[PDB]
Amino acid sequence: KITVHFINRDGETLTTKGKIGDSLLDVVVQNNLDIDGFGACEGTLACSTCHLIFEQHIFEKLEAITDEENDMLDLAYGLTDRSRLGCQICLTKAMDNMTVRVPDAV
Amino acid sequence: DKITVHFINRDGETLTTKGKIGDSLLDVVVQNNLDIDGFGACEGTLACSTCHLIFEQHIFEKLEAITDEENDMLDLAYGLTDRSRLGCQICLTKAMDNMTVRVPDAV
Ligand code: FES
Ligand code: FES
């Protein structure tokens, strides 16, 4: 179990624990996080509601992104250079105590 | 005299600096020459949105009354939130010490 911090759109910081090997969507869903409309296609790589923004140093070590995730992510809202589809990212001991931000929205 | 202001740059990196009381957040970026691209285009004349800034609720909540002037300009800013304001209209006060503002996301 590792700690993960989610900075919601409201500006609030949600600190939770997730099991190694789990997807960030599994963490949100299973821990019943506040984030709205997160993980709609349930990891089918059909949407981008699981869009998460990472810290440069964590972003750099993530599994190489596939064109499948990339093509969908490129059309997502509030994109950044450190953006990834949460459902495709699984927790690693290295991600312990990291902070992921949820894309902005009025 | 001065106060501390934490600026979260677009690249996610956090840059802190100090500005004089009465100075606009725009003045802070300019004078201290912060590395925030295309920020302050119209130079505080409310003729752009490039000074858009995201604030912490506890602060945003206690800012100067939003003027229709700013509203009609802030609505054209990309990546808006419920804690956005035009940095050039926000002048530093003591209650803002050690605050953290974030530049809207942009690829
Ligand atoms: S939940 Fe749809 S791509 Fe991740
Ligand atoms: S610098 Fe243009 S509106 Fe503030």
Swiss-Prot record, chain B:
Residues bound to [2Fe-2S] cluster: 42, 48, 51, 88
Tissue specificity as recorded in UniProt: Detected in adrenal cortex and corpus luteum (at protein level).
Gene Ontology BP terms: cellular response to cAMP; cellular response to forskolin; cholesterol metabolic process; electron transport chain; hormone biosynthetic process; P450-containing electron transport chain; respiratory electron transport chain; steroid biosynthetic process
Co-factor binding comment: Binds 1 [2Fe-2S] cluster.
Subcellular location: Mitochondrion matrix
Domain 2Fe-2S ferredoxin-type: 3-107
Keyword ATP-binding applies: no
GO molecular function, one term: 2 iron, 2 sulfur cluster binding
In-chain residues carrying the UniProt-annotated modification N6-succinyllysine: 2, 94
Cofactor(s) of this protein: [2Fe-2S] cluster
N6-acetyllysine: residues bearing it: 2
Main location: mitochondrion
One Gene Ontology cellular component: mitochondrion
Family statement drawn from the similarity comment of this UniProt entry: Belongs to the adrenodoxin/putidaredoxin family.
Quaternary structure note: Interacts with CYP11A1.
Protein name, per record: Adrenodoxin, mitochondrial
Organism encoding this protein: Bos taurus
Region of the whole protein represented: 63 to 169 of 186
